[PDB]
């Protein structure tokens, strides 16, 4: 679970590719791969900790989608409950029907 | 069902078991799951007797072989019951 609670973004596997030599297009004989190996790429994930109704709700999101946390706060109707709260404010409110 | 002729299986028949008729002590094969308490009531209502002490013990199957195939007879349980002073169980007096 290092995954963005709004966007859905999660870590992907990627190769890290080590190259040598001069681009063919700089008049080099061309690039060469000295190694290829798997790494991954995490989302740039942050806390957004926000106050909604009585309570203080904390989203874990990709820094990318940080705005949508505030969009979800602009959606306010009638919740006096505990944390959860976002269980409501979430995909129920992100999409629904 | 509500038993109680389910709880009491059969009289156990041996020099040992017979030697208990002399005192108030009658001894039966009972169903393996039966608590001392319910064995009491099952005898109290089967033989119209008062039961003042129950003793139980489990009896393990004996492994037996018909040749090539070995297995074991069922595990049993037996209760030896103390009927109240002077009472007896005539059903067991043959």
């Amino acid at each position: 679970s290092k995954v963005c609670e709004i966007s859905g973004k999660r870590p992907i596997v990627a190769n890290s590719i080590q190259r040598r030599g001069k681009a063919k297009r700089e008049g080099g004989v061309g690039k060469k791969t000295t190694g290829i190996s798997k790494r991954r790429q995490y989302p740039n994930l942050q806390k957004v900790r926000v106050r909604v109704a009585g309570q203080e709700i904390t989203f874990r999101v990709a820094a990318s989608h940080i705005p949508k946390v505030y969009e979800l706060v602009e959606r306010a109707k009638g919740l006096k409950l505990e944390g959860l709260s976002p269980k409501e404010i979430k995909k129920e409110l992100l999409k629904l029907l | 069902m509500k038993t109680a002729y389910d709880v009491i299986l059969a009289p156990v028949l041996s020099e040992k078991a017979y030697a208990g008729f002399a005192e108030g002590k009658y001894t039966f094969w009972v169903h393996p799951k039966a608590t001392k308490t319910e064995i009491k009531n099952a005898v109290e209502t089967a033989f119209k007797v008062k039961v003042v002490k129950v003793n139980t013990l489990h009896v393990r199957g004996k492994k037996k072989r018909l040749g090539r195939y070995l297995g074991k007879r069922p595990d049993r349980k037996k209760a030896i019951v103390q009927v109240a002073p002077g009472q007896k169980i005539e059903a067991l007096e043959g």
Partner: protein
Amino acid sequence: SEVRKQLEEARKLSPVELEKLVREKKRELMELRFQASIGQLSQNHKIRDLKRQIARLLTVLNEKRR
């Protein structure tokens, strides 16, 4: 036959009596055990079809409540 009638008399006779009739046959069965156990005192098949007829009763007893 016997069974046909036994099954027929058992319906129309309903449940408290069915329970009592069971409790009876059960006790009649326990007696049967004892006699086979002490040996020579039983000619079997009565053990079998008493057991069985207790089933038949109990199966009707089940009909009646459902």
